[PDB]
Amino acid sequence: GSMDWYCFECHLPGEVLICDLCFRVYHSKCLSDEFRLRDSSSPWQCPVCRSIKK
Numbered sequence: 001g002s003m004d005w006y007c008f009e010c011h012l013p014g015e016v017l018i019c020d021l022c023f024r025v026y027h028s029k030c031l032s033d034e035f036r037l038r039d040s041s042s043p044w045q046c047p048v049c050r051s052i053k054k
């Protein structure tokens, strides 16, 4: 998941990424491009959900 807005003070967009399995909210700018990439087919897994055992 995600939410995006446009800040009228700096005239740049902002985004948070929301894990589809644990619902944690990441600054999109805190994540590398590999861990931001989403496909229109499967849920976005955050760094913890991607990395944790079973």
Ligand SMILES: [Zn+2]
Pocket: 007, 008, 009, 010, 011, 012
């Ligand atoms: Zn701003």
Ligand SMILES: [Zn+2]
Pocket: 019, 020, 021, 022, 023, 024, 045, 046, 047, 048, 049, 050
């Ligand atoms: Zn997660």
